[PDB]
């Protein structure tokens, strides 16, 4: 067979923010080579690290800040300020630099040492919190900071800001377009849940039969009624239900163990040559568990890949190695 | 003024390899705001970190393996090898993974330890040579391996492989289409020279008068006949003139100093929100200087941005915090004369 690379975009972008979105939808083949996965069943991954700062959050940082400005909620003199688990902080720095607004961030030193190492360069100004802080380290921090410093700050409030969810109607349109309306199932690991709900509401609008599946850490299955627990899937498992979350739009929630998520992440880069992050591992494994169900035969399954594994080198993601063959590794992951 | 994000690609890719190329051409603004740069001249950057592994090398690693598999130089039973500790090794690992070929990358033990990890992630067999030996030590190991194992390896040979250069006819094609034939000048920091020449070859077929400019470390201006020397602009300044290099296609060569390249890279991310790498900082500076030249008013200048600054967090790229207002920094970057 022949392999054709991408053609010219035929567009000259005015600024980096215009290169956000329109991320590639790619077929998985290596990790899908399994007896119970029919050839008619298509498993596609939507690579969000193709965004300017390699994360799905690029859509969110841009939208939150952009709307706030056109709204009047953010105006000359004020400053953006948020508390995040990583990529959101980065996307806000990217938007701030372009719009000319100084950014302020507060995150838990426990996520990924290199996310902390990106905000400075952009012109940001940090503060970081305790691990096991989960959010009281991210969230509250800014709360107090703003408090006495009145109408000077604009808080992103990613977990409750509707402009987060809204940015994903584009993610949804992209999925619908790229599959020419064949998308049957969409799988998404949840952080703020802006992606899962934003996509769900926009796709349901185009076709109600689509099944929306949320993915969360088994060690902190909060969407499934459990309590905040410790886990290693960076980017998700906030430890509480986001205000922007709407269960009515989610059909099934799948819990994934931190380790299986890492292991899946390893198989995906090894057998498909796609270097996805930790949360992507959880999303893909859950997507593969759907692909083997008898009633999903022939269906088209789209899985969001939030980030790239390179932003996790400092972690244990690629530390331990896996024994056995591919089919061997795939079996341990599915059963 | 309205800001519109990208539209759906309206396409499903058979594999990651197919998402290579077709990189974005973006207008620079913040760093072009200096009295000596005219309002007409257009300064654009081609972001090659939009490739699947964030570097211009994805095009090269792909084409080398693809062309070899097509010609029969690479076949079942063989393995890929290459002494490289940069982006090319990563590029080859990605191709090998998809095409199903074992990859072997040789590099000094002591350096770039998780780029190493990135490579091991793809399942690459790392060949760590003696630290104080450097790249020459790794190349010696490669030569030793292929010599003791005749017919077993396929050497990428990025500095002398015509398939490197050929890959950039696409890069060229993209610049031509994206600028609707308007491109006047192309600036490219040189590593293997695959980019500057592959683009020049194709573009000089499109129209007469397209200026091709190569950029290199001012501390190792080998293309300019100077002597090899120590510099800090990763990705370029190989220290010798690559076999695929063809002086005929290059109109001008601009030497850029290491810290200047770094200083530009910071200004670009800070004032344009584009986190480019070291070599990108060098090319952009070079490109900006061309933009202040009287004869270049109203022209369209295209600058290649080889990689993302995220792959340089362990270096001193962002360690130094520049003092001064934006104008002070830009003015300090463009104050050299004649
Ligand atoms: C932010 C982030 C997510 C977010 O999922 P959402 O539903 O959009 O909040 C997922 N994965 C990673 C790695 C992230 O950084
Ligand atoms: C590979 C690479 C280059 C290459 O320049 P070429 O003329 O194409 O060899 C430049 N910069 C960086 C960072 C690279 O990795």
JSON list of N, CA and C and ligand atoms in Angstrom, two decimals, chain A residues 56-57 85 87-88 115 168 188-196 234-236 279 306-307 312, ligand 1:
[
{"chain": "A", "resi": 56, "resn": "UNK", "atom": "N", "xyz": [-5.40, 19.26, 24.63]},
{"chain": "A", "resi": 56, "resn": "UNK", "atom": "CA", "xyz": [-6.78, 19.60, 24.33]},
{"chain": "A", "resi": 56, "resn": "UNK", "atom": "C", "xyz": [-7.16, 20.91, 25.03]},
{"chain": "A", "resi": 57, "resn": "UNK", "atom": "N", "xyz": [-6.42, 21.24, 26.08]},
{"chain": "A", "resi": 57, "resn": "UNK", "atom": "CA", "xyz": [-6.69, 22.45, 26.84]},
{"chain": "A", "resi": 57, "resn": "UNK", "atom": "C", "xyz": [-6.49, 23.71, 26.06]},
{"chain": "A", "resi": 85, "resn": "UNK", "atom": "N", "xyz": [-4.55, 21.73, 36.83]},
{"chain": "A", "resi": 85, "resn": "UNK", "atom": "CA", "xyz": [-3.81, 20.49, 36.99]},
{"chain": "A", "resi": 85, "resn": "UNK", "atom": "C", "xyz": [-2.68, 20.42, 35.96]},
{"chain": "A", "resi": 87, "resn": "UNK", "atom": "N", "xyz": [-2.16, 21.49, 31.93]},
{"chain": "A", "resi": 87, "resn": "UNK", "atom": "CA", "xyz": [-2.37, 22.02, 30.60]},
{"chain": "A", "resi": 87, "resn": "UNK", "atom": "C", "xyz": [-3.22, 23.27, 30.53]},
{"chain": "A", "resi": 88, "resn": "UNK", "atom": "N", "xyz": [-4.22, 23.38, 31.39]},
{"chain": "A", "resi": 88, "resn": "UNK", "atom": "CA", "xyz": [-5.05, 24.57, 31.39]},
{"chain": "A", "resi": 88, "resn": "UNK", "atom": "C", "xyz": [-4.18, 25.78, 31.71]},
{"chain": "A", "resi": 115, "resn": "UNK", "atom": "N", "xyz": [5.20, 20.71, 33.53]},
{"chain": "A", "resi": 115, "resn": "UNK", "atom": "CA", "xyz": [4.09, 21.59, 33.18]},
{"chain": "A", "resi": 115, "resn": "UNK", "atom": "C", "xyz": [4.40, 22.88, 33.91]},
{"chain": "A", "resi": 168, "resn": "UNK", "atom": "N", "xyz": [-15.77, 22.86, 23.03]},
{"chain": "A", "resi": 168, "resn": "UNK", "atom": "CA", "xyz": [-15.85, 21.53, 22.50]},
{"chain": "A", "resi": 168, "resn": "UNK", "atom": "C", "xyz": [-16.96, 21.22, 21.52]},
{"chain": "A", "resi": 188, "resn": "UNK", "atom": "N", "xyz": [-14.28, 9.46, 26.40]},
{"chain": "A", "resi": 188, "resn": "UNK", "atom": "CA", "xyz": [-13.51, 10.58, 26.90]},
{"chain": "A", "resi": 188, "resn": "UNK", "atom": "C", "xyz": [-13.20, 10.53, 28.41]},
{"chain": "A", "resi": 189, "resn": "UNK", "atom": "N", "xyz": [-11.90, 10.58, 28.74]},
{"chain": "A", "resi": 189, "resn": "UNK", "atom": "CA", "xyz": [-11.45, 10.57, 30.13]},
{"chain": "A", "resi": 189, "resn": "UNK", "atom": "C", "xyz": [-11.77, 11.96, 30.69]},
{"chain": "A", "resi": 190, "resn": "UNK", "atom": "N", "xyz": [-12.32, 12.00, 31.90]},
{"chain": "A", "resi": 190, "resn": "UNK", "atom": "CA", "xyz": [-12.77, 13.26, 32.49]},
{"chain": "A", "resi": 190, "resn": "UNK", "atom": "C", "xyz": [-11.95, 14.00, 33.53]},
{"chain": "A", "resi": 191, "resn": "UNK", "atom": "N", "xyz": [-11.79, 15.30, 33.29]},
{"chain": "A", "resi": 191, "resn": "UNK", "atom": "CA", "xyz": [-11.06, 16.18, 34.20]},
{"chain": "A", "resi": 191, "resn": "UNK", "atom": "C", "xyz": [-12.06, 17.22, 34.67]},
{"chain": "A", "resi": 192, "resn": "UNK", "atom": "N", "xyz": [-12.39, 18.16, 33.79]},
{"chain": "A", "resi": 192, "resn": "UNK", "atom": "CA", "xyz": [-13.38, 19.21, 34.06]},
{"chain": "A", "resi": 192, "resn": "UNK", "atom": "C", "xyz": [-14.68, 18.74, 33.40]},
{"chain": "A", "resi": 193, "resn": "UNK", "atom": "N", "xyz": [-14.53, 17.73, 32.54]},
{"chain": "A", "resi": 193, "resn": "UNK", "atom": "CA", "xyz": [-15.61, 17.11, 31.77]},
{"chain": "A", "resi": 193, "resn": "UNK", "atom": "C", "xyz": [-16.11, 18.03, 30.66]},
{"chain": "A", "resi": 194, "resn": "UNK", "atom": "N", "xyz": [-15.37, 19.11, 30.43]},
{"chain": "A", "resi": 194, "resn": "UNK", "atom": "CA", "xyz": [-15.74, 20.04, 29.38]},
{"chain": "A", "resi": 194, "resn": "UNK", "atom": "C", "xyz": [-15.77, 19.33, 28.03]},
{"chain": "A", "resi": 195, "resn": "UNK", "atom": "N", "xyz": [-14.82, 18.43, 27.81]},
{"chain": "A", "resi": 195, "resn": "UNK", "atom": "CA", "xyz": [-14.74, 17.69, 26.56]},
{"chain": "A", "resi": 195, "resn": "UNK", "atom": "C", "xyz": [-15.92, 16.74, 26.38]},
{"chain": "A", "resi": 196, "resn": "UNK", "atom": "N", "xyz": [-16.11, 15.85, 27.35]},
{"chain": "A", "resi": 196, "resn": "UNK", "atom": "CA", "xyz": [-17.20, 14.89, 27.26]},
{"chain": "A", "resi": 196, "resn": "UNK", "atom": "C", "xyz": [-18.59, 15.53, 27.12]},
{"chain": "A", "resi": 234, "resn": "UNK", "atom": "N", "xyz": [-2.78, 11.41, 35.54]},
{"chain": "A", "resi": 234, "resn": "UNK", "atom": "CA", "xyz": [-2.69, 12.86, 35.47]},
{"chain": "A", "resi": 234, "resn": "UNK", "atom": "C", "xyz": [-3.61, 13.51, 34.45]},
{"chain": "A", "resi": 235, "resn": "UNK", "atom": "N", "xyz": [-4.33, 14.53, 34.89]},
{"chain": "A", "resi": 235, "resn": "UNK", "atom": "CA", "xyz": [-5.23, 15.25, 34.01]},
{"chain": "A", "resi": 235, "resn": "UNK", "atom": "C", "xyz": [-6.70, 14.97, 34.28]},
{"chain": "A", "resi": 236, "resn": "UNK", "atom": "N", "xyz": [-6.98, 13.87, 34.97]},
{"chain": "A", "resi": 236, "resn": "UNK", "atom": "CA", "xyz": [-8.36, 13.51, 35.29]},
{"chain": "A", "resi": 236, "resn": "UNK", "atom": "C", "xyz": [-8.50, 13.21, 36.78]},
{"chain": "A", "resi": 279, "resn": "UNK", "atom": "N", "xyz": [-3.82, 9.84, 30.60]},
{"chain": "A", "resi": 279, "resn": "UNK", "atom": "CA", "xyz": [-5.27, 9.87, 30.48]},
{"chain": "A", "resi": 279, "resn": "UNK", "atom": "C", "xyz": [-5.72, 9.24, 29.17]},
{"chain": "A", "resi": 306, "resn": "UNK", "atom": "N", "xyz": [-6.13, 13.27, 24.91]},
{"chain": "A", "resi": 306, "resn": "UNK", "atom": "CA", "xyz": [-5.85, 14.60, 25.44]},
{"chain": "A", "resi": 306, "resn": "UNK", "atom": "C", "xyz": [-4.44, 15.19, 25.33]},
{"chain": "A", "resi": 307, "resn": "UNK", "atom": "N", "xyz": [-3.43, 14.35, 25.52]},
{"chain": "A", "resi": 307, "resn": "UNK", "atom": "CA", "xyz": [-2.07, 14.85, 25.50]},
{"chain": "A", "resi": 307, "resn": "UNK", "atom": "C", "xyz": [-1.05, 13.85, 24.99]},
{"chain": "A", "resi": 312, "resn": "UNK", "atom": "N", "xyz": [5.32, 13.73, 30.16]},
{"chain": "A", "resi": 312, "resn": "UNK", "atom": "CA", "xyz": [5.29, 12.82, 31.32]},
{"chain": "A", "resi": 312, "resn": "UNK", "atom": "C", "xyz": [6.58, 12.04, 31.52]},
{"chain": "C", "resi": 1, "resn": "LIG", "atom": "C1", "xyz": [-6.96, 18.79, 31.06]},
{"chain": "C", "resi": 1, "resn": "LIG", "atom": "C2", "xyz": [-6.74, 17.36, 30.68]},
{"chain": "C", "resi": 1, "resn": "LIG", "atom": "C3", "xyz": [-7.86, 16.52, 30.40]},
{"chain": "C", "resi": 1, "resn": "LIG", "atom": "C4", "xyz": [-9.23, 17.15, 30.47]},
{"chain": "C", "resi": 1, "resn": "LIG", "atom": "O1", "xyz": [-10.34, 16.34, 30.23]},
{"chain": "C", "resi": 1, "resn": "LIG", "atom": "P1", "xyz": [-11.59, 17.39, 30.30]},
{"chain": "C", "resi": 1, "resn": "LIG", "atom": "O2", "xyz": [-12.97, 16.61, 30.21]},
{"chain": "C", "resi": 1, "resn": "LIG", "atom": "O3", "xyz": [-11.54, 18.27, 29.12]},
{"chain": "C", "resi": 1, "resn": "LIG", "atom": "O4", "xyz": [-11.50, 18.34, 31.59]},
{"chain": "C", "resi": 1, "resn": "LIG", "atom": "C5", "xyz": [-7.64, 15.16, 30.07]},
{"chain": "C", "resi": 1, "resn": "LIG", "atom": "N1", "xyz": [-6.37, 14.68, 30.01]},
{"chain": "C", "resi": 1, "resn": "LIG", "atom": "C6", "xyz": [-5.27, 15.45, 30.25]},
{"chain": "C", "resi": 1, "resn": "LIG", "atom": "C7", "xyz": [-3.88, 14.87, 30.16]},
{"chain": "C", "resi": 1, "resn": "LIG", "atom": "C8", "xyz": [-5.44, 16.82, 30.60]},
{"chain": "C", "resi": 1, "resn": "LIG", "atom": "O5", "xyz": [-4.37, 17.61, 30.85]}
]
